[PDB]
Design a protein around this ligand. Sequence first.
Ligand SMILES: CCc1cc(-c2ccc(C)o2)n(-c2ccc3c(c2)nc(-c2cc(C(=O)O)ccc2O)n3Cc2ccc(=O)[nH]c2)n1
Ligand SMILES: O=C(O)c1ccc(-c2ccc3c(c2)nc(-c2cn[nH]c2-c2cccc(Cl)c2)n3CCCn2ccnc2)cc1
Length: 140
Amino acid sequence: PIVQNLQGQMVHQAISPRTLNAWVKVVEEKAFSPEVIPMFSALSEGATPQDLNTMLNTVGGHQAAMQMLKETINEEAAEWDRLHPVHGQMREPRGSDIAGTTSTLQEQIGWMTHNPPIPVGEIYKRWIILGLNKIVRMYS
Ligand SMILES: CCc1cc(-c2ccc(C)o2)n(-c2ccc3c(c2)nc(-c2cc(C(=O)O)ccc2O)n3Cc2ccc(=O)[nH]c2)n1
Ligand SMILES: O=C(O)c1ccc(-c2ccc3c(c2)nc(-c2cn[nH]c2-c2cccc(Cl)c2)n3CCCn2ccnc2)cc1
């Protein structure tokens, strides 16, 4: 995630094992429950798209759930491209860039800290939450 240090600068730091552990814990302890969703938000504060993918991959053995998530992400990325088509320079992010599949961590941090910013982590996070809601329904 990207966090503000003591001075006031925005610095990147890795996800802790503790955080990844708590995430796997909640996904399984509360499997199928929407209770998982606010915990996802809590555990992913300041997350970049790469971070979100690390979290998803740690629970990536769930075949049907991951497939539902993937198709949701694909749909949202397509809608992003419709809503915001791409026309010290910096290229603008496309749907696949927000999902972290075609962008580097450097590029993601660049967008998030740009003036003015595009919070690609927060955007991707919403797509994932859409997916999580659909997983709840698929297993209701
Ligand atoms: C928002 C709530 C949520 C989000 C995710 C979630 C997972 C990954 C991501 C990104 O999100 N899950 C979730 C958690 C555990 C799961 C799961 C989905 N799907 C299975 C599963 C079911 C069957 C199947 O039912 O055929 C066969 C194989 C399976 O991997 N398990 C395992 C399981 C299965 C039964 C049980 O009682 N407990 C746990 N729930
Ligand atoms: O759903 C959300 O939460 C959500 C949705 C959309 C946005 C969003 C999308 C595109 C945005 C934006 C903000 N701000 C700008 C914007 C406005 N001026 N410069 C930029 C910019 C240019 C290059 C890289 C980056 Cl990082 C920003 N653009 C680029 C617009 C096109 N452009 C290109 C140059 N000047 C303007 C933010 C949040």
